[PDB]
């Protein structure tokens, strides 16, 4: 079921810098690519992002539900949502449909805010289709190319790093992972978010 509209999402952490990358393919019947702009990463808050992979309709439905809930909470509280709260609500939403679930495997990436000045701590996590949250504190992968991404990140991860090194490592890992998958690829997009600014770039990937 996941082969239909395959996808890949990845995320890495560094020193006061985080990165999330995704593939840009939307296919049909597995072996027929239809569009090359379907982006799996959606901005949910100024410092919270969610990368969803799986059935496209399920992705869109879940994104809309999350946007509704997050906007409601933010308006009611008149303050930005925390990554902890977003992750917990995502787990609850995923479990709410344990039977007849959403065929999507999302990952949450962003900054945890430590007030006292203020501090930004990278936050990453990956989920199952039921909401099986599992914190990892380092690279997170999700999609049909999970195995290749796991291998690449294990071989290439360098612990904390400068944002340039983080971008290089994540881009190389994603490009290597996609090149070994047939139902995923067709361009890649990378986001590097840091407290000061956010950079979005698109790679010159193998578009065939």
């Amino acid at each position: 079921i996941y082969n239909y509209n395959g996808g890949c999402v990845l995320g890495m952490s560094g020193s006061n810098c985080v990165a999330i990358a995704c593939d840009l393919r939307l296919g049909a019947n597995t072996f027929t690519t239809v569009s090359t702009k379907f982006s799996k990463i959606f901005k949910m808050n100024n410092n919270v992002y969610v990368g969803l992979s799986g059935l496209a309709t399920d992705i869109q439905t879940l994104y809309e539900i999350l946007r509704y809930r997050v906007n409601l909470y933010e308006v009611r509280q008149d303050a930005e949502m925390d990554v902890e709260c977003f992750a917990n609500m995502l787990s609850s939403i995923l479990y709410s449909n344990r039977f007849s679930p959403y065929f999507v495997n999302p990952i949450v990436v962003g900054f945890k805010l430590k007030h006292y000045k203020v501090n930004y701590e990278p936050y990453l996590t990956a989920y199952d289709l039921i909401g099986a949250k599992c914190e990892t504190r380092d690279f997170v992968v999700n999609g049909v190319t999970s195995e290749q991404l796991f291998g690449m990140c294990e071989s290439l991860y360098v612990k904390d790093q400068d944002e340039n090194g983080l971008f290089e490592t994540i881009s190389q890992c994603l490009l290597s992972a996609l090149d070994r998958d047939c139902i995923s690829g067709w361009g890649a997009e990378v986001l590097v978010l840091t407290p000061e600014k956010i950079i979005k770039k698109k790679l010159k990937a193998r578009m065939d």
Partner: protein
């Protein structure tokens, strides 16, 4: 049956006797103002003073936000206002979920007035005793400003005032308001109206609140003026 209150039932002249009482209660609340300018829409208001121990920081009791492009002011019962504000937020977010686009203000005011009318007609429950001044911005029509009431009656306005002494505030607005106005000039006019309606020659920075919404840089955003900002504004006003 013997204890029935006769809520949804026409009066011998067709007024229901309950909307009228709710409106007369509205007239006793503190005054709220509304202006539309070339740079944004303003909803200056007047804070009712309960004591000197209220938390001055934040604690906005008259102006609220329904969405990134919609924000309104209350002129009646606070509890009814809060429940209706909640309903407004749910309605706006439900529309965004359905159509993947921000809801035009007219739809929101229509839905709010629909729920108020439903409470005014069906059942035997008393009507909501609150009247808003919903203002916002959207691409279809641009800056707008409306005015509801307990009967679900709504109408557009360029500049208006509700609550106690709304007559004098409206007179001042009609005397001074102009078609094309700067945001700062609109703030000055709002301060003048609040001062005149309150019967105070010089408004007190601790007795009023102001806010405005503008589509700066193509991204609509609201600003709620703070104590220092309102102090500077009143300094400018007295300067002129």
């Amino acid at each position: 049956r013997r204890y029935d209150s006769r809520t949804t039932t026409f009066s011998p002249e067709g007024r229901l006797y309950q909307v009228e009482y709710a409106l007369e209660a509205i007239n006793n609340a503190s005054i709220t103002i509304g202006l539309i300018t070339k740079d944004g829409v303003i909803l200056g208001a007047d804070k009712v003073f309960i004591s000197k121990l209220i938390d001055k920081a934040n604690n906005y009791e008259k102006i609220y936000k329904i969405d990134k492009h919609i924000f309104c002011g209350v002129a009646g019962l606070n509890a009814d206002a809060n429940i209706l504000i909640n309903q407004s937020r749910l309605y706006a977010q439900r529309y965004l979920y359905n159509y993947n686009e921000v809801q035009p203000v007219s739809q929101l005011v229509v839905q709010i007035c629909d729920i108020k009318q439903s409470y005014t007609q069906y059942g035997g429950l008393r009507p909501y005793g609150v009247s808003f001044l919903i203002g916002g911005y959207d691409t279809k029509d641009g800056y707008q400003l409306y005015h509801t009431d307990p009967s679900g009656n709504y109408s557009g306005w360029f500049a208006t005032a509700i609550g106690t002494n709304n007559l004098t505030a409206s007179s001042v607005l009609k005397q001074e308001w102009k078609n094309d106005m700067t945001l700062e000039e609109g703030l000055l006019l709002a301060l003048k109206t609040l001062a005149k309606s309150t019967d105070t020659e010089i408004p007190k920075s601790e007795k009023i609140e102001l806010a405005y919404l503008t589509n700066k840089d193509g991204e609509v955003y609201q600003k709620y003026l703070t104590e220092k900002e309102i102090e500077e504004l009143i300094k400018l006003y007295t300067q002129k």
